[PDB]
Amino acid sequence: MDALEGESFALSFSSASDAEFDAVVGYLEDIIMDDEFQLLQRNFMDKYYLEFEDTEENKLIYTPIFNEYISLVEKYIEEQLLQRIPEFNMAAFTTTLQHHKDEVAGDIFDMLLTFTDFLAFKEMFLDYRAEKEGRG
């Protein structure tokens, strides 16, 4: 496939349009495949997947555990990005990302989606434990 697009796109300064946005997406993938990231993720997931048990009642332990993930993992990603971008805005980034999910690789964000999607977070752990029993 081949096309020609580039006339009314952007005025003169490209950034939040797709130039800078995409740039961030790249720096993200570099960390996702990063060895140090694989260790940290699996390290905490080893305990988290244990606490998250399929039950009919809701436990209060889910509140502290969740906050820990947002302060440990979510914060980790932010810090790593700021190391090169002191003017980064993770707040406005994530908000717009929700809609930009139509352009950016959805399969990739699906992982980060666990930032608020409690359904993806839980389903993620339950799926991890299922693989331990050999299935799929």
Q: What is the domain partition of the chain in residue ranges?
A: 1-136
CA dist 80 and 69 (Å) reads: 16
Q: Which amino acid is at 101?
A: K
CA dist 74 and 68 (Å) reads: 9
Task: Select 1-136's CATH number: 3.30.420.40, 3.90.1300.10, 3.30.465.10, 1.20.1520.10.
Answer: 1.20.1520.10
Output the CA–CA distances (angstroms, integers) from residue 53 to 41, 48, 61, 120, 134, in the order listed: 19, 10, 11, 14, 18
Give me 68's structure tokens.
């820990």
- Report DSSP state, residue 70: I
Which three-class secondary structure state does DSSP give residue 84? coil
**Long-range pairs of 9-16 with CB within 8 A, sequence gap ≥ 24:** 16/96
